[PDB]
Each structure stands twice: as structure tokens, then as C-alpha cells.
């Protein structure tokens, strides 16, 4: 109950909302049925439209008009945006040539250049090029400022998750807004688009920019706009706020457009009906910039033009029905559409079994357009698991499709030709970024980057210290002329040991054998040299990775590879080797098929043992440095050391073998050599972060050997592929992956075929950033290069997506 009998006279778009039951006059009162009786009349005027006409010029101020063309309007802050053009001979901002903004050119009293976030719903990246002829204001921002070819959204590529990621820097799993609809079991409550629960603060985690600003004494424009307030009124209200007195004027402002998303849902991304919404957005941009130029702010403010996600072609007829797969379809609740999330209809049904639902949804139809996963088995790059609001069962839906429970759910709901939500590496989901202003560079293109990075930059732009977030602060310093943040490398926490030969073979009782007794100081001082790190500059190109937690580990050197061997996990944390373009693939000689050799540098009590593998009927083993890539028959003996061994399910050894035997060589041929770093990951609580030893849920039977949840590889070469990887003078090129260490290949529907028909498609789906691997290992890579740290941070955030060109 609001006593809605106060009045908005003098309070229109007041910046501190008032506490019940005083009625409200802020830009959100409509949305709480809480506006003063006179809000419309005083605050939402519309008389005479939005533009000055020649015969309104110098008019006498009439307070009823939506905007003014009177002589006093400039200093009242309330002219129509085209006032100076119509009435004072000025040009529109879009008609002026752009000129570099080397310094903020601001009115006296401005402590810092304001930021204006101009956000557009459903603005797909390819609109920047494909609609360029009808978006002249946007094209000018783009080409005069700083722009990326596209900006990657977060998964799922829905509205609320992505806008709240822009606000916080966080993955949805950490901010809490994990879809446009959710159920939280702890609250026993649901969050929905229509309705009131979504206003409760308990849904919204992390610290959004407007709160970060406020706490640090920067004032924020009440960000968000009741949907019926027209765009023109939003722009005029921003422009008015910008005329406030110095002590009351905000430094950060937001504008949001529901277009082009709204039309895209109806017409598809490239419907002929989409040209008009794109014109109308561009005209709103022009009204802002014209209005800024009137207030002499057009070379003062930083403007960000940003989208939340793209839009794909999706129609009712491309719907898969869980009723064509499940007999038990009424015992489940589906969150449906461009993703699926399944839970039990009822907590009291102990006959509900996730294992059987997953099995019934796995590879059941030739062209099945969705793939089921337990959330911990989703690709790690999605960072979509560590929230109680994310259901254990997930369906990743193919682009262009929907999933639904039963056909009645669709025809008793074709209405629509566009949707979004799919995998955030899909091209049609990509969105836009442009920054224009004194703090952004001039006419600069930057590489694609993820929207999780922007919160840090927006903090940099306002002089704020960002709250902890999932950006990598400094990775977007190349967007900025100044205000850059100067990050430093984390300190190494554990220093390694460098063990020499300390154990005699007979001290080991590991149940390992090798046909190796088959026995000249030409090649004896030589192998001594190799075990002391004579070849280390070949196989360790960017320095050793730094260990950023407390542990006990050893550096081991070999002719062909170098490893950091964990005495706690009994296996390498990392293994580093270089494969030149010229290198050759060999086979494991027959006599050496089951050979495992004790490492006389490493105690038996810190070694794996072959007997546990024998007794463990599910678990086999592989090697991190592959025997197939040995430089010589003699060096190959090093690859069978028990310290190079790691636990592998037979199903996973198919993947791993194909990667090591076939793909590494292919990459070296294509990239002119590659440096590889491989190793295990343990993420049993699926939080994206390295497990401690007390979090491991599975061991090789009868032993303390922990079973990895994943295996990673980082593959680095020269960006200039005319230079070989081991003699690169400039920028690097990386691709990486985090493969799930699974006891079956159910994920790959074509897995009974040869590895050449399915392993690469799996690896592509499990592409990763080096930063993702950092979080999962507590390692810090690329510590010694000739490159600036900022450029290295950029490299560590790169994702190789395998999509074609936008
Ligand atoms: C992406 O970036 C983010 C941001 O940096 C990273 O997330 C952080 O990771 C930290 C490590 O997991 C985590 O730190 C923990 O915080 C606990 C207290 O946190 C509360 O206060 C903060 C501060 O304001 C607040 O942000 C938190 O918010 C979470 O929960 C609220 C309420 O539910 C939500 O609104 C909000 O969305 C947010 O949810 C997300 O995080 C939680 C985890 O906190 C998840 O469970 C959710 O699913 C969701 O993902 C909190 O309100 C603190 O209590 C923890 O301390 C334990 O461990 C330390 C180790 O140092 C130890 O000293 C203590 O003993 C303690 O143990 C005791 O508790 C254990 C667990 O209850 C118990 O088992 C023991 O037996 C002990 O009793 C810890 O410090 C930090 O909160 C989050 N921050 C955010 C915003 O998520 C994220 O890791 C990055 N991701 C990647 C991939 O890099
Ligand atoms: C989430 C919110 C806190 C937020 C943060 C930030 C921005 C904008 C922000 O919110 C803009 C805004 O005013 N609205 C957000 C959108 C929702 C979704 N919707 C719908 O019901 C809706 C809209 C489109 C849809 N597509 N598919 N389902 C849909 C559902 C109406 C509703 C309109 C209001 C900036 C980017 C400026 C910075 C950070
Ligand atoms: Ca076995
Ligand atoms: Ca973990
Ligand atoms: Cl959703
Ligand atoms: Na399979
Ligand atoms: Zn939408």
C-alpha cells in the first residue's frame, strides 16, 4: 500500500527514491505501482513532440511541452536535442568530421569525464556491418572510437544473465542470475520475467557497478527505465541530469533499448522488418550525441555502445520434445527453449533417477538437436555449474532449435522467428562493443573479448576499485588511451626442488617392469647434461609456470620435456615440450609396450605404482609427454618414467592417444612448431578452481593416486608463423583445451567410429582460455617472455572458438 497522494512537482526523476508510503517520482515508480498521482502529467509530457521546428525557435517557454526551443532552454538543461541545429545554424554531431579527443574537453566543475552506457538488447555483432547504411551515428562511434569485431556474451545467452554480467564482471553462476527463469530450492522460490519475486534482492549477488560507484563516492544515475517511458524521454532525462549542479550530478549513466531484440524475436535476425528498429536506435544515438554537443559534452563524456547477446533463426517447427524420448515425462520439470534444465517434479519421489533420464536422452535419434549433460560435464569454458539454481541435468541445444517437454507446451503457449540462449561461442549469439571518448583510443580496432571483462574497464573509467570479479584486470588495457591499470605478476608461493639421482632401482617395489636393461662417454656426459636442463630453453619457452599455492614439487629435466612433479598428487602439475615443424612421429617399439620405469630422482613413497593400475579394473594410464614424439630411441626411455604417467580411463585414452599421436604433429606442421604444456585438473566440486587434496572424490583403487576430472593442454606458437615457435621475436598465438576425463565416450555420438571422425569435434567443444586453466590448476603461465604483461593477460583470455568468420 502506497499512499500515492504526494506530488512530483519539482521531483521529476529524483535520484534518491523515497521510502514508503511517500509516493515515488523516480524512473522505476511505474514498475512498483508507486508513482505519485501526477507523475504522468508533470514527468511524462509529450506535447509538441521531440524536435524543434523553425517556428518554435525563440518561442516563449511553455512548461507543458515535452522539450523546449525557448532562449532559456540551454541553461535550464531542457532543450529538444535538435535545438541548436534548427534554431542556431549548428550541424548534427553525425555530420561533423571526427577529430581525435586527446584530452577530456569538459565544462568547469567536471571532476572526471562522465560514462554513459548505451545498451541495446539483442544486437547481434554482424549488424554493425550489415546494417551500416542505416546506422550513421553508430557507424561514426564505431569507426572514430575503439571497437571490437564482436564481444562474446556469457552462457546462457539470455537477457538477465548477460546484463547482470555487464554490471558485475561475474559469471552467472557467481552472480546468481543463471537464467531468465530460475528455481532456488533453499528459498523454495521461483524467479520469473513477469512478476514480483525478481525484485527481491536475494536473487542478485556480487556488486554491480552502480553500487561500486556509490560506496566509493561516485554518484550514479538511477540506471533502469520503466518500459513505457519512451526512448526520447530517457535521453532528455540523462541530458537534464548532466545539467545538475556539480555536487548533485551523477558521473555514470545508463540507457537501455529493448530493440532490436523485441523485433528480432518476431521477425528473425535479418527479417526485412529489422531495418526500421535499427534506424530508430541510430536516431536515438544521434539525439544523445546532438544533446551532448549542445551541452559542450561531446568531447568530454565516454560513451559505451554495448549489447547483451545476438539473435538466431528459430521457429516452432524446430522443436524437439522430451515426450519423444522419455516415457516418464510428467515426473520432470523442464526449463525449456534454447537451453534445457531438468529437475524432478517432486522431492517426495525417490523413484526419480537422473542417470536414467540422461541415458534416455543420449544419442537416441540420428540428427538429435540437443545433447544432455550433467552440469559438471558441461565444457568448462561455460562456467555453468557452481550454483544451486542450475539444475544437475542440462541440455545444450543446437543453434536454430528449441527443446520442450510435450507438444502441447508449444501450440498451447508460429508466434516467433528469432531466439537466443545457445552456447556463447555460436556466431549468431555474439554482440557488439564500441567505446568512444577521451579515455578510449582513436580509430582503433581491438580483438574480440568477453563481456566479463567490461566491469573492470568501467571501473577504470570512473576511477573505481572493482569488487572481486571474473575479469582479468589489465587484459583490456589496450582499449584505453590512459587510466590503464598496471597489473603485476602474482608472486610464486612454492619454490620447486631440483632433485638429482638419489635412489637405487631396487629400492622401488612398484610392480612396474620395462625391457630396458639393454646397454662411451660421447653419449654419457651428454644425457647427464639433459637431466640437468641442457635442453630446457627448447622445451620451456616462456619460463616455468609459477605455483601459486603451498605445496611440495620437483622440477624434472629430460631431453624432450620438462615437468613440475607434485609429491602430493604423485603426478606432474604440468609437462612442457616443444615439437618443431620438422619433428617426426615414431611408434612405441613392441618390447617397450607396457614399460614403466622408476625415476631414480623421486622417492618410491612419492611415486605411483603399476600394481594399482593392474588391480583397478576400470582405470588404465597414459603419459603427459607422449612416447610417440621422442627425439631418439634412447630419449624415448624417458617418456616411460613413472613420473610422466597419469591415470586414464580406456575410453579417454582413445581421445588422448589421437591428440598426442596425430594432432600435435598436425598443429606443429600448420603453426610452424608448437610448444605444448599439458597436465591434469581436479575440480570435483565443479567450482572452476583447483581442488585441495581433501576434495578429491576418486583414487586409483588401493592407492593414494588421485583421478583427474580433466586433462588440459596449452599450445603456443608464433603469431607470425614465418618464425618457428622456438625462435619467435613477437606476439604469440595460443589455443587450449580442458577435456573431461570420462569413463565413457557417451558425449560423442559417433565414437564407435575411428578417432579421426569424432575426437577433434570433442576437443573443439572443450576449447578453453589459458586463464580457465590457471584458475583450475593454481598455476601462472607465460612468466618470462619478451612481451608486455598486458599483452600476456590478453593472450591468457583468448578463446579459440573454431567458428567461421563473422
Ligand atoms: C569468479 O569471481 C568470483 C568473485 O571473486 C569468485 O567467487 C568467490 O570465490 C570465493 C571462493 O569460492 C568465495 O569466498 C568464500 O566466501 C564465503 C563468504 O561469502 C559471502 O560473502 C561474500 C562477500 O560480500 C559474498 O559475495 C558471497 O556471495 C555468495 O553467496 C551469496 C549468498 O548465497 C549470493 O548472493 C552470491 O550470488 C554469492 O554466490 C556465489 O558464491 C557462493 C560461494 O560464496 C556459491 O556457493 C554460490 O553458488 C555462488 O556461486 C557470500 O555471501 C566464505 O564464507 C568462504 O570461506 C570458507 O573457506 C575459507 C577459505 O579461505 C575458510 O577460511 C573458511 O573456514 C570458510 O569455511 C567454512 O565454510 C565452508 C563452506 O560453508 C564450510 O564447509 C567449512 O566447513 C567452514 O564452516 C569463502 O571465502 C566468494 O564468496 C566468491 N564470490 C562470489 C561473488 O561468488 C569465483 O570463484 C570466480 N570464478 C572463477 C571460475 O574464477
Ligand atoms: C538487469 C539489469 C540490472 C541491468 C543491468 C545493466 C544494464 C541494464 C540492465 O537492465 C536494463 C533494463 O532496463 N531492463 C532489463 C531487461 C529486462 C528483461 N525484460 C524482459 O522481460 C525480456 C526482454 C528481452 C527478452 N528476450 N527473451 N526474453 C526476454 C525478456 C524486460 C526488462 C526490461 C528492463 C546495463 C547494460 C545498462 C548495465 C548493467
Ligand atoms: Ca587397470
Ligand atoms: Ca574445485
Ligand atoms: Cl533461462
Ligand atoms: Na559415444
Ligand atoms: Zn530476447
Q: Which atom of ligand 2 is nearest to the CA of 223?
A: 37
Nine cell digits for residue 605: 613413497
d(CA 707, CA 284): 56
Q: Could you tell me the sign of the dihedral formed by the alpha carbons of 752, 757, 758, 763, in that order?
A: positive
Integer angstrom CA distances of residue 497 from 454, 489, 551, 565, 765: 40, 22, 11, 10, 37
SS3 label, residue 760: helix
Tell how far CA 607 is from the center of its chain: 38
Nine cell digits for residue 800: 579459440
d(CA 704, CA 617): 16
- Tell me which DSSP letter residue 380 carries: G
Nine cell digits for residue 788: 608486455
Residue keyed to cell 552440469? 375
Say which ligand is closest to the CA of 256.
2
Strands 302-307 and 433-436: antiparallel
Neighbours of 121 (CB within 10 A): 22
Tell whether 687 is in a known binding site. Answer: yes
Which residues, at least 6 apart from 130, have a Cβ–Cβ distance to it below 8 Å? 270
Which is nearest to 701 in space by CA: 609, 606, 610, 613?
A: 613
Which residues have C-beta under 5 Å from ligand 3, the single-atom ion? 613, 616, 620
CA atoms within 13 A on the CB side of 72: 5
Which residues, at least 6 apart from 716, have a Cβ–Cβ distance to it below 8 Å? 541, 542, 674, 675, 676, 677, 725, 732, 733, 734
Which is nearest to 121 in space by CA: 273, 222, 238, 255?
A: 255
Q: Is the CB of 165 under 6 A from ligand 1?
A: no
Residue keyed to cell 532562449? 71
Nine cell digits for residue 501: 639421482
Strands 418-419 and 115-121: unpaired
Query: Quick check: 655 and 756 in contact, CB under 8 A?
Result: no
Q: How far apart are the first and last CA of the chain?
A: 52
Which is nearest to 40 in space by CA: 233, 173, 215, 171?
A: 233
Q: In terms of DSSP H, where are the helices of 127-207?
A: 127-130, 136-144, 159-168, 172-175
- Full domain range(s) for residue 783: 505-797
Kindly report the protein residue whose alpha carbon is nearest to atom 33 of ligand 2: 227
Q: Which of 4, 81, 157, 159 is catalytic?
A: 159
d(CA 510, CA 97): 76
Which is nearest to 240 in space by CA: 256, 257, 221?
A: 221
Q: Is the CB of 771 under 6 A from ligand 1?
A: no
Separation of 505 CA from ligand 3 center, angstroms?
A: 24
CA atoms within 13 A on the CB side of 687: 6
d(CA 183, CA 345): 12
Query: Quick check: 578 and 675 in contact, CB under 8 A?
Result: yes
H, E, C per residue of 2-69: CCCCCCCCCCCCCCCCCCCCCCECCCCHHHHCCECCCHHHHHCCCECCCCCCHHHCCCCCCCCECCEC
Query: Quick check: 741 and 641 in contact, CB under 8 A?
Result: no
Nine cell digits for residue 1: 500500500
Q: Which atom of ligand 2 is nearest to the CA of 224?
A: 13
Kindly report the protein residue whose alpha carbon is nearest to atom 37 of ligand 2: 254
Which is nearest to 178 in space by CA: 322, 14, 385?
A: 385
Kindly report the protein residue whose alpha carbon is nearest to atom 22 of ligand 1: 206
SS3 label, residue 452: helix
- Tell me which DSSP letter residue 266 carries: H
Residue keyed to cell 579459440? 800
Neighbours of 218 (CB within 10 A): 20
Separation of 161 CA from ligand 5 center, angstroms?
A: 8
Phi, psi angles (nearest 5°) of residue 475: -70, -20
Here the CATH number for the domain that contains residue 538 is 3.40.570.10
Residues recorded for the chain: 806
Query: Quick check: 87 and 52 in contact, CB under 8 A?
Result: yes
Q: How determined?
A: X-ray
Kindly report the protein residue whose alpha carbon is nearest to atom 43 of ligand 1: 174
d(CA 37, CA 4): 6
Which residues, at least 6 apart from 214, have a Cβ–Cβ distance to it below 8 Å? 220
Q: Is the CB of 383 under 6 A from ligand 1?
A: yes
Tell whether 147 is in a known binding site. Answer: no
Neighbours of 143 (CB within 10 A): 15
Query: Quick check: 776 and 689 in contact, CB under 8 A?
Result: yes
Integer angstrom CA distances of residue 714 from 246, 461, 545, 616, 770: 51, 33, 12, 30, 7
Which is nearest to 562 in space by CA: 583, 528, 535?
A: 535
Q: Which atom of ligand 2 is nearest to the CA of 254?
A: 37
SS3 label, residue 132: helix
Active site residue 722: no
CA atoms within 13 A on the CB side of 777: 29
Which residues have any ligand 2 atom within 6 Å of their CB?
A: 117, 119, 121, 159-160, 163-164, 166-167, 180, 193, 224-225, 227, 254, 256, 261
Buried b (16+ CB within 10 A) or exposed e, 547-586: bbeebebbbbbbbbbbbbbbbebbbbbbbbbbbebebeee
Which residues, at least 6 apart from 124, have a Cβ–Cβ distance to it below 8 Å? 264, 269, 307, 310, 311, 428, 429, 430, 431, 432
Query: Quick check: 671 and 725 in contact, CB under 8 A?
Result: yes
Separation of 688 CA from ligand 4 center, angstroms?
A: 6
Kindly report the protein residue whose alpha carbon is nearest to atom 21 of ligand 2: 193
d(CA 435, CA 478): 12
Q: What's this structure's resolution in Å? A: 1.9
Which is nearest to 402 in space by CA: 362, 369, 378, 363?
A: 369
SS3 label, residue 560: coil
Say which ligand is closest to the CA of 471.
1
Burial class (CB in 10 A: 0-12, 13-18, 19+), 423: buried
- Tell me which DSSP letter residue 649 carries: -
Query: Quick check: 694 and 706 in contact, CB under 8 A?
Result: no
Say which ligand is closest to the CA of 777.
4
Kindly report the protein residue whose alpha carbon is nearest to atom 15 of ligand 2: 160
Phi, psi angles (nearest 5°) of residue 393: -100, 130
Query: Quick check: 423 and 384 in contact, CB under 8 A?
Result: no
Q: After which residues is the chain discontinuous, taking C to N > 2.5 Å?
A: 413, 519
Integer angstrom CA distances of residue 164 from 221, 461, 618: 17, 19, 43
Separation of 335 CA from ligand 7 center, angstroms?
A: 16
Q: Is the CB of 468 under 6 A from ligand 1?
A: yes
d(CA 338, CA 122): 14
Phi, psi angles (nearest 5°) of residue 334: -110, 130
d(CA 485, CA 465): 10
Which residues, at least 6 apart from 409, have a Cβ–Cβ distance to it below 8 Å? 336
Which is nearest to 235 in space by CA: 282, 284, 281?
A: 284
Query: Quick check: 683 and 711 in contact, CB under 8 A?
Result: no
Tell whether 689 is in a known binding site. Answer: yes
Nine cell digits for residue 714: 596449452
d(CA 402, CA 417): 12
Tell whether 392 is in a known binding site. Answer: no
Separation of 163 CA from ligand 2 center, angstroms?
A: 6
Integer angstrom CA distances of residue 3 from 6, 13, 769: 8, 19, 54
Helices and strands in the chain: count of H runs, count of E runs = 23, 29
Neighbours of 3 (CB within 10 A): 9
Q: Is the CB of 174 under 6 A from ligand 1?
A: yes
Strands 402-404 and 319-321: parallel
Q: Which atom of ligand 2 is nearest to the CA of 255?
A: 37
Query: Quick check: 762 and 748 in contact, CB under 8 A?
Result: yes
Which of 174, 191, 392 is the best mutation target for the ligand 1 pocket, counting ligand atoms within 8 Å of the beta carbon and taking the most? Answer: 174
Prior bond of 260 cis (ω within 30°): yes
Residue keyed to cell 532456488? 184
d(CA 191, CA 699): 40
Residue keyed to cell 516452432? 316
Q: Which atom of ligand 2 is nearest to the CA of 306?
A: 36
Kindly report the protein residue whose alpha carbon is nearest to atom 14 of ligand 2: 224
Nine cell digits for residue 101: 579527443
Name 575's bridge partners: 563, 678
Name 319's bridge partners: 402
d(CA 451, CA 454): 6
Which of 203, 205, 450 is the best mutation target for the ligand 1 pocket, counting ligand atoms within 8 Å of the beta carbon and taking the most? Answer: 205
Tell whether 330 is in a known binding site. Answer: no
Say which ligand is closest to the CA of 647.
3
Residue keyed to cell 547504411? 133
Which is nearest to 649 in space by CA: 615, 696, 616, 690?
A: 616
H, E, C per residue of 301-318: CEEEEEECCCCEECCCCC
Which is nearest to 709 in space by CA: 701, 726, 697?
A: 697
Helices 136-144/275-294 angle, 10° precision: 60
Angle at 420 between CA 687 and CA 407, to 5 degrees: 100
Kindly report the protein residue whose alpha carbon is nearest to atom 48 of ligand 1: 387
Amino acid at each position: 500500500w502506497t499512499a500515492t497522494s504526494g506530488s512530483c512537482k519539482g521531483r521529476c526523476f529524483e535520484l534518491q527514491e523515497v521510502g514508503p508510503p511517500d509516493c515515488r517520482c523516480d524512473n522505476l515508480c511505474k514498475s512498483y505501482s508507486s508513482c505519485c498521482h501526477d507523475f504522468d502529467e508533470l514527468c511524462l509530457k509529450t506535447a509538441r513532440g521531440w524536435e524543434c521546428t523553425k517556428d518554435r525557435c525563440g518561442e516563449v517557454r511553455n512548461e507543458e511541452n515535452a522539450c523546449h526551443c525557448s532562449e532559456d532552454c540551454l541553461s535550464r538543461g531542457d532543450c529538444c536535442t535538435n535545438y541548436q541545429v534548427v534554431c542556431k545554424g549548428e550541424s548534427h554531431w553525425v555530420d561533423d568530421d571526427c577529430e581525435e579527443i586527446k584530452v577530456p574537453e569538459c565544462p568547469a566543475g567536471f571532476v572526471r569525464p562522465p560514462l554513459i552506457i548505451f545498451s541495446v538488447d539483442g544486437f547481434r555483432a554482424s549488424y554493425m556491418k550489415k546494417g551500416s547504411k542505416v546506422m550513421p551515428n553508430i557507424e561514426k562511434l564505431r569507426s572514430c572510437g575503439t571497437h571490437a569485431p564482436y564481444m562474446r556474451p556469457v552462457y546462457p545467452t539470455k537477457t538477465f544473465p548477460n546484463l547482470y554480467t555487464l554490471a558485475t564482471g561475474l559469471y552467472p553462476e557467481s552472480h546468481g542470475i543463471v537464467g531468465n527463469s530460475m528455481y532456488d530450492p533453499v528459498f523454495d522460490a521461483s524467479f520469473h520475467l513477469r512478476g514480483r519475486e525478481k525484485f527481491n534482492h536475494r536473487w542478485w549477488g556480487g556488486q554491480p557497478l552502480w553500487i561500486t560507484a556509490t560506496k566509493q563516492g561516485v554518484r550514479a544515475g538511477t540506471f533502469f527505465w520503466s518500459v513505457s517511458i519512451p526512448h526520447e524521454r530517457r535521453i532528455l532525462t540523462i541530458l537534464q541530469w548532466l545539467s545538475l549542479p556539480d555536487n548533485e550530478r551523477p558521473s555514470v549513466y545508463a540507457f537501455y533499448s529493448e530493440q532490436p531484440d523485441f523485433s528480432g524475436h518476431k521477425y528473425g535476425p535479418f527479417g526485412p522488418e529489422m531495418t526500421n528498429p535499427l534506424r530508430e536506435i541510430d536516431k536515438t544515438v544521434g539525439q544523445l550525441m546532438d544533446g551532448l554537443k549542445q551541452l559542450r559534452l561531446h568531447r568530454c563524456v565516454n560513451v559505451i555502445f554495448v549489447g547483451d547477446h545476438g539473435m538466431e533463426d528459430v521457429t516452432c517447427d524446430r522443436t524437439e520434445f522430451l515426450s519423444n524420448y522419455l516415457t516418464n515425462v510428467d515426473d520432470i520439470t523442464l526449463v525449456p527453449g534454447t537451453l534445457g534444465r531438468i529437475r524432478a517434479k517432486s522431492i517426495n519421489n525417490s523413484k526419480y533417477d537422473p542417470k536414467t533420464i540422461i541415458a534416455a536422452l543420449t544419442c537416441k535419434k540420428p540428427d538429435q538437436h540437443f545433447k544432455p549433460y550433467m552440469k559438471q560435464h558441461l565444457p568448462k569454458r561455460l562456467h555453468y555449474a557452481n550454483n544451486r539454481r542450475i539444475e544437475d541435468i542440462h541440455l545444450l541445444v543446437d543453434r536454430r532449435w528449441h527443446v520442450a517437454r510435450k507438444p502441447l507446451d508449444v501450440y498451447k503457449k508460429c508466434f516467433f522467428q528469432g531466439d537466443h540462449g545457445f552456447d556463447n561461442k555460436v556466431n549468431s549469439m555474439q554482440t557488439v562493443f564500441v567505446g568512444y571518448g577521451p579515455t578510449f583510443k582513436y580509430r582503433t580496432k581491438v580483438p574480440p573479448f568477453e563481456n566479463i571483462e567490461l566491469y573492470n574497464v568501467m571501473c577504470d573509467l570512473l576511477g573505481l576499485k572493482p569488487a572481486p570479479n571474473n575479469g582479468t584486470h589489465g587484459s583490456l588495457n589496450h582499449l584505453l588511451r590512459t587510466n590503464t591499470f598496471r597489473p603485476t605478476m602474482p608472486d610464486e608461493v612454492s619454490r620447486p626442488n631440483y632433485p638429482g639421482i638419489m635412489y637405487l632401482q631396487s629400492e622401488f617395489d612398484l610392480g612396474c617392469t620395462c625391457d630396458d636393461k639393454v646397454e662411451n662417454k660421447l653419449e654419457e656426459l651428454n644425457k647427464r647434461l639433459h637431466t640437468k636442463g641442457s635442453t630446457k630453453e627448447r622445451h620451456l619457452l616462456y619460463g616455468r609456470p609459477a605455483v601459486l599455492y603451498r605445496t611440495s614439487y620437483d622440477i624434472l629435466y629430460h631431453t624432450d620435456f620438462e615437468s613440475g612433479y607434485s609429491e602430493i598428487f604423485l603426478m606432474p602439475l604440468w609437462t612442457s615440450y616443444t615439437i618443431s615443424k620438422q619433428a617426426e612421429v615414431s611408434s612405441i617399439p613392441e618390447h617397450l609396450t607396457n614399460c614403466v620405469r622408476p625415476d631414480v630422482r623421486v622417492s618410491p613413497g612419492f611415486s605411483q605404482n603399476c600394481l594399482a593400475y593392474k588391480n583397478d579394473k576400470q582405470m588404465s594410464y597414459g603419459f603427459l609427454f607422449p612416447p610417440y614424439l621422442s627425439s631418439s630411441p634412447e630419449a624415448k626411455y624417458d617418456a616411460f618414467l613413472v613420473t610422466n604417467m597419469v591415470p586414464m580411463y580406456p575410453a579417454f585414452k582413445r581421445v588422448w592417444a589421437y591428440f598426442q599421436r596425430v594432432l600435435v604433429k598436425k598443429y606443429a606442421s600448420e603453426r610452424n612448431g608448437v610448444n605444448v604444456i599439458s597436465g591434469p585438473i581436479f575440480d570435483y566440486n565443479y567450482d572452476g578452481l583447483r581442488d585441495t587434496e581433501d576434495e578429491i572424490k576418486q583414487y586409483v583403487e588401493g592407492s593414494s593416486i588421485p583421478v583427474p576430472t580433466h586433462y588440459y593442454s596449452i599450445i603456443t606458437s608464433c603469431l607470425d608463423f614465418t618464425q618457428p615457435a622456438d625462435k619467435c621475436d613477437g606476439p604469440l598465438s595460443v589455443s587450449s583445451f580442458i577435456l573431461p576425463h570420462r569413463p565413457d565416450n557417451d558425449e560423442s555420438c559417433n565414437s564407435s567410429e575411428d578417432e579421426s571422425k569424432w575426437v577433434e569435434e570433442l576437443m573443439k567443444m572443450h576449447t578453453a582460455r589459458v586463464r580457465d586453466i590457471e584458475h583450475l590448476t593454481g598455476l601462472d603461465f607465460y612468466r618470462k617472455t619478451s612481451r608486455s604483461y598486458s599483452e600476456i593477460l590478453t593472450l591468457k583470455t583468448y578463446l579459440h572458438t573454431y567458428e567461421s568468420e563473422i
